[PDB]
Structure 1
C-alpha cells in the first residue's frame, strides 16, 4: 500500500506514535517519506546482506527474521514480511522498540540526515488529526 501523507499521519497517531519517546508526529511522517515514500512494500538490500523492510525500512540485522541475515536477531519477534503489510501495526510496534534502544530516531540514518532539525511539522500541515 502507498499511503497518503495525512492518511499515514492518522494511522501513526492512532497507533500512538505521536510524541512517542518525545518525537512529534511530523518526525515519523518525515522518516517514512524518505525511507519508503510511504510504500508499505518498500525493500532495500544493505551491503552487509541485511534487508530493510516497510514504511520505516526496519532492518533484519536486529529487528525481524527473514531467514537470510546470518548472525542477526529478531528483537521485534516478527517475520520481516509483517513489515510489508497494508496494516502498519507491526511496523509501528517495532519502531517503538527501535526508538527506545538509546539513540532515539538517529537509528534511522535518513531521519538524521533529512528530517532532524528541519520544520517537521510541515509533514502534518493541513491533516485532520
Structure 2
C-alpha cells in the first residue's frame, strides 16, 4: 500500500508513534518518506546481504527474520514479511524498539541525513489529526 502523507500520519498516531521517545509525528513521517516513499511494500538489499523492509525500512541484520541474513538476529520477533503489510502495526511496534535502542532516530541513517534538524512539522502540516 502506498500511503498518503496525512493518511500515514494518522495511522502512526493511532499506533502511538506520535512523540514516542520524544520524536514528534513529523519526524516519523519524514523518515517514512525518505525510507520508502510511503510504500509498505518497499524492500532494499544492503551490501552486507541484509535487507530493509517496509515503510520504515527495518533491517534484517537485527530486527526481523528473513531466513537469508547469516549471523543476524530477530529482536522484534517477526518475519520480515510482516513489515510489508498494508497494516503498519508490526512496523510501528518494531520501530518503537529500534528507536529505544540508544541512538534514537539516528538508527535510520536517512532520518539523520534528510530529516534531523529540518522543519519536520511540514510533513504533518494541514493534516486532520
Gaps of 5+ in 2: none
- Tell me how many residue pairs correspond in the alignment: 129
Q: 1:118 corresponds to which residue?
A: 118
CA RMSD of aligned residues (A): 0.1
Q: 1:37 corresponds to which residue?
A: 37
Query: Deviation per CA, 1:19-52, whole angstroms, max 9, x where unpaired?
Result: 0000000000000000000000000000000000
Matches within 5 A, 1:30-109: 30-109=30-109
Query: Deviation per CA, 1:45-72, whole angstroms, max 9, x where unpaired?
Result: 0000000000000000000000000000
CA displacement at 1:9 relative to structure 2: 0.1
CA displacement at 1:116 relative to structure 2: 0.1
d(CA) in 2 for partners of 1:99 and 1:119?
20
CA displacement at 1:91 relative to structure 2: 0.1
Query: Deviation per CA, 1:64-113, whole angstroms, max 9, x where unpaired?
Result: 00000000000000000000000000000000000000000000000000
3-state SS of paired residue (1:31) = helix
